[PDB]
Design a protein around this ligand. Sequence first.
Ligand SMILES: *C(=O)N1C[C@H](NOS(=O)(=O)O)CC[C@H]1C(N)=O
Length: 245
Amino acid sequence: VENEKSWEKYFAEYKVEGCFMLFNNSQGTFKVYNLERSQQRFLPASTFKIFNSLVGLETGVIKDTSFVIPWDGVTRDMPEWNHDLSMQQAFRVSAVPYFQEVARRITKPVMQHWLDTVKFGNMKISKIDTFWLDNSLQISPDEELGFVKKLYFDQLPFHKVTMQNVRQVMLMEKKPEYELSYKTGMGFSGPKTIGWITGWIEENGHPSFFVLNIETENKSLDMRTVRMNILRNLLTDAGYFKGMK
Ligand SMILES: *C(=O)N1C[C@H](NOS(=O)(=O)O)CC[C@H]1C(N)=O
């Protein structure tokens, strides 16, 4: 593990705290800003959709990535969500109600079995449809990094087609120079807003795994935009987006 202290630049620019972890498979380099935070636990918020999708597909609650759960007719603050959505659409717009219904169909005893089998964070369920957003379940950035690396390499205890389907829906940006796959998250913990982006970037078929975790006590900061700007600035600094990795 190399300590990359210059990455503080991109967090200080937004007056936030955070860590960044970057594992470049092909060059065998592993860089981390804020090692202490990388070992601290936080609620996963919407990054848990990776796990929920895996278990939903594996148990067969979700038939395939086109599987539709209708809108329940409850109008929510995000217009994207007030529709009948396929798994792929719900994942990409981060539609919480889709995955709350997945969790209820999985059921708490089955969910607990899969948390325990994968050894996912503190493995703690409060309520079946809130536990990844209400600060009961917690996971560290280093744990999220290990999890997505195992997902990429088919090392989790799921069927290969289950894991291929989740990798496919995680693909968010594709150019000839790079393919960027990730899941974002945002949650609340005490006075703090916690932001996540977990995923990988592939250039020439070579993956680099990353986890970004940020926090602020400034209630007026736009975490949704700031987390993405910070990720793009960090990966640009590290030499990505040009097809050279
Ligand atoms: C997940 O963290 N959430 C669902 C939704 N989209 O989040 S994302 O942009 O982080 O993927 C809004 C934020 C958050 C929530 N409020 O539950």
